[PDB]
Design a protein around this ligand. Sequence first.
Ligand SMILES: *[C@]1(O)CO[C@@H]2[C@H](C#C)CN(C(=O)[C@H](CC(C)C)NC(=O)c3ccc(-c4nc(N5CCN(C)CC5)sc4F)cc3)[C@@H]21
Length: 217
Amino acid sequence: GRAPDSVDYRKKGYVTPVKNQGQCGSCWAFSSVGALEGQLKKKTGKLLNLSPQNLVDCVSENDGCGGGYMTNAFQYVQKNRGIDSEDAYPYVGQEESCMYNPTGKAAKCRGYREIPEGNEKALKRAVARVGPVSVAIDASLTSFQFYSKGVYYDESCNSDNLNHAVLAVGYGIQKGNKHWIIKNSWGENWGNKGYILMARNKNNACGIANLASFPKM
Ligand SMILES: *[C@]1(O)CO[C@@H]2[C@H](C#C)CN(C(=O)[C@H](CC(C)C)NC(=O)c3ccc(-c4nc(N5CCN(C)CC5)sc4F)cc3)[C@@H]21
């Protein structure tokens, strides 16, 4: 069974508005909540902002504003038996004491799956079947950071230099250039209303399929 040629989970109401992480190195936490928000919508029919601050403060196997992995975040939610809503545990952009409150719990996690390393076909199939998928990329180039439009490709991107965590919310094509639809956490003023289209099936450009995972619930 082949997946659809294009998919956009924003059209299905799976994707919350674009957030701004500020100076804190919490990309991993926004990536993780985005993937959880998608699964929560699929489960309950309700689209709700989940708490990246809950993750920043409480995932002891991560480094708060110094960075983290999404898989560690999913493990925390699984162990903790929940994650709070944004409303119950708001974002402040600095690491603080863990103040998780189970009465504000808005989602749970049964585990996570990792996409086979470097496999863009497997990533495509996972996005199609599951929903938004957490991904890591090389976002270090100024060409990435100044993105405004089109399908982003830069030969200098290094798939071994994973330095940013974002969310793949779909995939498709523009002017014949296959792409991934990527939600960033640098605010709506960045990119195209907070989004970037990144080259798809161009030899795993920017490491898009090197550290991709999604939560189960
Ligand atoms: C994002 O916001 C983007 O910029 C900053 C960083 C820079 C520059 C890179 N960032 C990250 O979060 C990356 C994301 C990956 C997916 C590419 N991750 C890390 O930088 C990172 C991962 C994991 C850890 C980590 N620390 C642990 N410690 C901390 C010390 N403590 C005493 C014990 C536990 S466990 C662990 F997995 C740190 C950083 C952001």
